Design a protein around this nucleic acid. Structure first.
Ligand SMILES: [Mg+2]
Lengths: 406, 467
RNA sequence: UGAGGUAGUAGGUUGUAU
DNA sequence: TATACAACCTACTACCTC
């Protein structure tokens, strides 16, 4: 007794019966259905009765609207019930509900009490249930790798997420405090209103006839009241300001330019060299700047074979949705500890080679170490314009309601 | 501290009415939607190319296993998946000799060489299509690696009206005849023999062979006219459109050509996914905004196509783009749109540098996590970690799409769900999903093919003539 | 170009004042 | 007409993995 007998309405339920028979045969079982194993020129009813009585260890019954009141299916079910009574096996008959149009009150009473297997929603979940029931009932199976692979595929097809919260670290540095107000200086004097615009110690750019800065008028004296408007930062961050003097969007552009210039100038004074890219600028630490390239045990700067790679941060301030700094991570290869390579192709290829064995943990650890080293106090660092802007050294966090378990 | 919502993974409909999330799992367990009886292939190239193609076709029939099947399901054989025959006994071979290839391959210039090689490869196709009595479903053009290497716009010889790209020009010159062709490389099917330094192959397909078989089989089955899968959770009469702009380079004055891809649900419960073509042109250099007349023409053509396909007008029309629509083109769009139809214009970009790192685990962020910034903005992680396959879809920390509703009013969650469902209709490959929506990607393919030539007047809408 | 992903290199446009 | 930049746009490779 090792056969799995499948009963169905022959001219109406062939697709599912053939699918299930082939899937079960492919999993190492031995099935019997009249559409694949009944011989030609044989007395078919006596053969079916003999198979049910002496060969089947399980009796799968495809219960649908067509086969509910089919005479052949009823005869086979009756013989199966008698054989189950003889065998004293409670789980001999397993109905498979493949039709959603068969009401619970319309199923024939012989199988109403039996616990069926749901195939209406999905045939793969039903096959998983069949496999679980067969494994629990110790149905005989004779398999070698193909059956295991198909079994694993069937089990894993429905794998999904679990509702476990998780915390994600981003690369956005939020802004805590802004200066009291944005300063517009209507000088127009002092060398065509500071014609350099690119050499003053404090960040400032020229407007129509004014200079926009957070610094005082008596702070650019090395390279060089009537200051009007003086818009506050808090009122303009919410975008509640208007009028033809300057558009609100242009104000936001002006201030974000101011933070970008301040970020460049502040840590350009940190005695750290930089790298020039196609559109931005990135800044990497030297080999000898760290003792010894293990800031918080993070291995900031190393070597691949004989070329030294350095971790670099490229930052840019943005105001959408709320004022933060987006900073990105790069890898720069130099032959010596403090040098540079003009071969873009070699640098790119070696960067891609280095980035193939780092992964999320190493990326986050090195990013956090670099952002902690750039800090100037316990939990932030300040940018100078005689005013200061505090930028948190801890990137903002995100909370998710779902995750996985490796 | 911010909150991320999760978008449930969409399902795709396979045979027997059965839905799944993985194309490979559904194709292995159930099979394709429609039944075509067989594929008759026409092979072009040298005798070595024919031998390589025959060897690969023979290798395809038997099941192929990956090194790790928990991530890449094994290929069970072409007939065991697509219940149709694609054998080497039904090959109509057209011969291209090495002398003919080398006559123009090693000659000077970059535009003349590619043009001559494409002509040599395409005249055989046209003649066998018109002057032969054998029916060929797909034409498989086996290209030697020398032609592939030496037919690039920026290629340089190793010291001894049309685009310089072999593939795009080849597909553009074949548009008037509607011949679905697949361009194969010798090193793609014979990777084991193209060694580089010490017998190590240039491309290592040893642990990938199953995935390569899956991709090639899916592409061949789609080009032959088969439907491998369709979206199961498509909404009501809403129609999705996607615009992509391309440069026509130094062909005839600075011009920008816009091409569209269109998807919706027909009355037969299937999915209609084609392209709106006739690339609408803008003469201004550097501007990627359609002029009002051309925008009205585009919307009128798309609406007429929808009305002919269905019978009424769509309830709402979503528009995707990599750019932001201006007021003039949107007013032109609305001038044609009927009152009952709601116009929504959405901008999808992959430029915002927002990387999320897991605090403890070594894997990346779950795919489908969405950061709703506000009513008309969101960050969607279309590429990330998939629990079903114990590996991520990217290598480093993936970049998320920045989806922002530019024009009109619509639910941001519904837009994110629609985009995540649209990312499942890539018939050019057999993968789980891709980061970009398939509408934008296929519009990209259509545009980059149609911009390689100027003789095309009425391009076909179907995708098998481009992809 | 079997297919995706991540980078790098270049150029262009709009707006803001000279 | 050039500067300078904020904010967006495409075109073309090289590399790694499925
Ligand atoms: Mg393809």
């Amino acid at each position: 007794r090792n056969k799995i007998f499948i009963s169905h309405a022959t001219p109406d339920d062939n697709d599912f019966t053939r699918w299930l028979a082939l899937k079960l045969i492919g999993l190492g079982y031995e099935v019997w259905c009249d559409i694949l194993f009944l011989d030609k020129g044989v007395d078919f009813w006596s053969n079916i009765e003999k198979v049910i009585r002496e060969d089947t260890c399980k009796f799968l019954l495809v219960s649908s609207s067509y086969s509910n009141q089919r005479e052949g299916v009823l005869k086979e079910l009756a013989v199966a019930a008698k054989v189950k009574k003889q065998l004293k096996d409670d789980k001999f008959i397993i109905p498979l509900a493949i039709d959603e149009q068969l009401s619970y009150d319309d199923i024939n009473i012989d199988i109403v009490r039996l616990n069926a297997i749901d195939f209406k929603m999905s045939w793969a979940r039903g096959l998983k249930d069949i496999l679980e029931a067969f494994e629990k009932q110790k149905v005989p199976k004779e398999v070698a790798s193909k059956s295991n692979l198909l079994y694993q595929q069937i089990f894993l097809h429905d794998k999904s997420v679990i509702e476990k919260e998780e915390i994600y670290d981003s690369n956005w540095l939020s802004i805590l405090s802004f200066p009291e107000e944005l300063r517009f200086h209507e000088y127009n004097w002092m060398l065509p209103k500071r014609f350099d615009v690119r050499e003053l110690t404090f960040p400032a750019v020229r407007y129509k006839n004014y200079l926009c800065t957070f610094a005082w008028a008596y702070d650019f004296t090395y390279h060089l009241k009537s200051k009007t408007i003086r818009i506050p930062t808090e009122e303009i961050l919410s975008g509640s300001y208007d009028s033809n003097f300057i558009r609100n969007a242009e104000c936001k552009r002006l201030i974000v330019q101011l933070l970008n210039k301040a970020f460049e100038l502040r840590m350009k004074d940190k005695e750290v060299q930089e790298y020039e890219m196609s559109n931005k600028t990135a800044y990497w630490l030297e080999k000898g700047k760290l003792e010894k390239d293990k800031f918080e045990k993070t291995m900031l700067v190393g070597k691949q074979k004989d070329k030294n790679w350095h971790f670099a941060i490229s930052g840019a301030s943005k105001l959408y949705p709320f004022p933060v700094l987006m900073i990105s991570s790069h890898i720069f290869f130099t032959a010596d500890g403090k040098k540079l390579i003009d071969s873009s192709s070699v640098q790119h290829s070696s960067r891609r080679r280095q980035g193939k064995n780092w992964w999320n943990n190493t990326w986050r650890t090195k990013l956090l170490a670099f952002i902690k080293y750039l800090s100037d106090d316990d939990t932030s660092f300040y940018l100078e314009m005689e005013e200061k802007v505090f930028v948190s050294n801890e990137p903002v966090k995100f909370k998710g309601n779902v995750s996985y378990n490796i | 501290m911010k909150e991320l919502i999760y978008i449930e993974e969409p399902k795709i409909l396979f045979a027997h009415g059965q839905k799944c999330t993985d194309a490979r799992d559904g194709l292995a367990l159930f099979g394709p939607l429609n039944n075509l009886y067989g594929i008759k292939s026409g092979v072009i190239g040298t005798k070595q190319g024919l031998k390589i193609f025959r060897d690969y076709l023979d290798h395809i029939q038997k099941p192929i296993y990956n090194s790790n099947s928990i991530t890449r399901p094994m290929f069970p054989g072409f007939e065991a998946v697509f219940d149709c025959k694609w054998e080497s006994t039904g090959i109509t071979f057209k011969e291209v000799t090495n002398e003919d290839i080398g006559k123009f391959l090693y000659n000077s210039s970059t535009h003349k060489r590619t043009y001559d090689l494409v002509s040599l490869f395409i005249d055989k196709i046209i003649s066998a299509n018109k002057n032969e009595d054998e029916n060929v479903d797909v034409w498989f053009v086996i290209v030697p690696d020398e032609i592939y290497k030496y037919c690039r716009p920026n290629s340089v010889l190793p010291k001894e009206n049309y685009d310089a790209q072999f593939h795009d020009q080849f597909k553009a010159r074949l548009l008037k005849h509607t011949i679905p062709t697949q361009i194969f490389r010798e090193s793609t099917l014979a990777w084991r023999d193209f060694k580089n330094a010490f017998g190590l192959p240039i491309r290592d397909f040893s642990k990938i062979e199953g995935h390569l078989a899956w991709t090639i089989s899916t592409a061949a089955f789609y080009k032959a006219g088969g439907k491998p899968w369709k979206l199961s959770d498509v909404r009501n009469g809403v129609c999705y459109l996607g615009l992509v702009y391309k440069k026509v380079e130094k062909s005839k004055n600075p011009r920008n050509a816009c091409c569209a891809a269109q998807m919706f649900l027909d009355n037969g419960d299937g999915t209609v996914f084609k392209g709106e073509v006739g690339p609408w042109y803008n003469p201004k250099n550097g501007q990627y905004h359609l002029e009002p007349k051309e925008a009205k023409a585009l919307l009128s053509q798309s609406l007429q196509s929808y009305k002919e396909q269905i019978g009424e007008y769509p309830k709402e029309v979503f528009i995707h783009a990599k750019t932001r629509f201006n007021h003039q083109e949107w007013d032109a769009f609305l001038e044609v749109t009927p009152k009952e139809t709601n116009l929504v214009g959405v901008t999808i970009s992959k430029t915002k540098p927002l990387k999320l790192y897991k605090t403890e685990g070594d894997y990346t962020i779950l795919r489908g996590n969405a950061y709703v910034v506000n009513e008309r903005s969101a960050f969607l992680w279309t590429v990330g970690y998939v629990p079903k396959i114990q590996t991520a879809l990217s290598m480093e920390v993936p970049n998320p799409l920045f989806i922002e509703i530019n024009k009109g009013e619509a639910d941001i969650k519904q837009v994110l769900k629609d985009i995540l469902s649209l990312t499942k209709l890539n018939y050019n490959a057999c993968i789980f999903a891709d980061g970009e929506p398939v509408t934008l990607r296929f519009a990209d393919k259509i545009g980059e093919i149609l911009t390689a030539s100027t003789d095309i007047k009425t391009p076909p809408l179907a995708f098998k003539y481009y992809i």
